[PDB]
Amino acid sequence: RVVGFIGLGRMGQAICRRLLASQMPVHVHNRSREKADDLIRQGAVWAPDIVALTRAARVLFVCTAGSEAVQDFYHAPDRGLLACLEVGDIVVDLSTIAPETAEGLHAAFAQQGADYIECPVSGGVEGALAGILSAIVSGRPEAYGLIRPLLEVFCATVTYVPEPGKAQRLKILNNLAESINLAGAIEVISQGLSQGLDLKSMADVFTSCRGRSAYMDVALGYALSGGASSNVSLGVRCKDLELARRRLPQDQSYPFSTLAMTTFDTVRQACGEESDQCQYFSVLSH
């Protein structure tokens, strides 16, 4: 069964590699075609546009960053997804997007007799390549049941929360906690270095004692490797912080949340959109 895939960024490429590794036939499309080259070498089929992709595939994955990509891929007249879908098609959107955007796409797909599956993921490039991503899934149960065995190829945990927009709500809150944990872990590692502590002992303690977190692991991996990419850009991190910022209530202060939004915005301004989320390390020391 042929599956399509749009968005060959860091996460998209990694999920595609996992699908190819299970011997799924995969047709791939990206705005920047050079990011398909390695996938093509490994058996993927290039689709130059959404028309060609939808001809071949009745189930498609989307893994892009930003609201402009939502607009271009879904709503471009004649050329976009909504114009090319057939009745019974399913799109599994793995992007992190605003819940109201996801809700609107659920409704637009239903009008066409197709199904939007809202499927944000967590686990990074590393989890994609090992096939152990966590998915949060909103959408209708029959379409979910049909694509569920596909998610199994690259996911370990899948949380089905049917209400449209609910998966994105949970993902954005998950990533706010990532951002707080990451900034704290970088501060704690940095202080330890200034205090004379060796990275090996800090890694030993911060993975075994209860300061441990998934993103402490990220920060330690970054420090231990001398800056090997965590494969999350500040552009992607700040996109999610901005989604969270727009959901902050006017009646209660959340200082750690608001600090995380401002902190990574400043690091983005100082280091550039494509630089690593962990570049807070270098900003911290100035």
Ligand X SMILES: NC(=O)c1ccc[n+]([C@@H]2O[C@H](COP(=O)([O-])OP(=O)(O)OC[C@H]3O[C@@H](n4cnc5c(N)ncnc54)[C@H](OP(=O)(O)O)[C@@H]3O)[C@@H](O)[C@H]2O)c1
Which positions lie near a copy of itself, rule CB under 8 A? 122-124, 134, 136, 156-157, 159, 161, 166, 169-171, 173-178, 180-181, 183-185, 187-188, 190-192, 194-197, 201-202, 204-206, 208-216, 218, 247-249, 252, 254-257, 259-260, 263, 284-286
Half-sphere exposure of residue 144: CA atoms within 13 angstroms, side-chain side: 17
Name the binder of 181 from ligand 7VD, a copy of itself, ligand X, none, CB < 5-8 A by kind.
a copy of itself
* Alpha-carbon torsion, ordered 275, 278, 283, 284, to 10 deg: 180
232 contributes a contact to ligand 7VD by CB under 6 A: yes
Where in 152-181 is the site for ligand 7VD (CB under 6 A)?
A: 175, 178
168 contributes a contact to ligand X by CB under 6 A: no
63 contributes a contact to ligand X by CB under 6 A: yes
Question: In angstroms, rounded to a whole number, what is the distance separating the alpha carbons of residues 250 and 254?
Answer: 10
29 vs 169 by CB, closer to a copy of itself: 169
Q: What sign for the dihedral angle of Cα 9, 61, 77, 54? A: positive
Question: In angstroms, rounded to a whole number, what is the distance separating the alpha carbons of residues 116 and 118?
Answer: 6
Question: In angstroms, rounded to a whole number, what is the distance separating the alpha carbons of residues 270 and 249?
Answer: 28
List the one residue from 60, 237, 244, 257 that touches ligand 7VD (CB under 6 A): 237
122 contributes a contact to ligand 7VD by CB under 6 A: yes
3-class DSSP assignment, residue 101: helix
179 contributes a contact to ligand X by CB under 6 A: no
Residue with tokens 């001809």: 55
Q: Distance from CA of residue 166 to its chain's centroid? A: 16
Tell me whether residue 200 is one of the annotated catalytic residues.
no
54 vs 174 by CB, closer to ligand 7VD: 174
234-245 and 166-194 helices cross at what angle (nearest 10)?
Answer: 120
The catalytically annotated residue of 29, 166, 171, 268 is: 171
Q: How far is the CB of 90 from ligand X (least distance, A)?
A: 19
Question: In angstroms, rounded to a whole number, what is the distance separating the alpha carbons of residues 257 and 49?
Answer: 39
42 vs 201 by CB, closer to a copy of itself: 201
List the one residue from 7, 9, 99, 124 that touches ligand 7VD (CB under 6 A): 124
Cβ burial, residue 145 (10 Å; 0-12/13-18/19+): exposed
- Point out which residues pair with 62 in neighbouring strands: 6, 93
Binding mask 110-149 for ligand X (x = CB under 6 A): -----------xx-xx------------------------
List the one residue from 18, 30, 74, 151 that touches ligand X (CB under 6 A): 30
Q: Quick one: tokens of 164?
A: 């449209």
Q: Which residues are catalytic?
A: 171
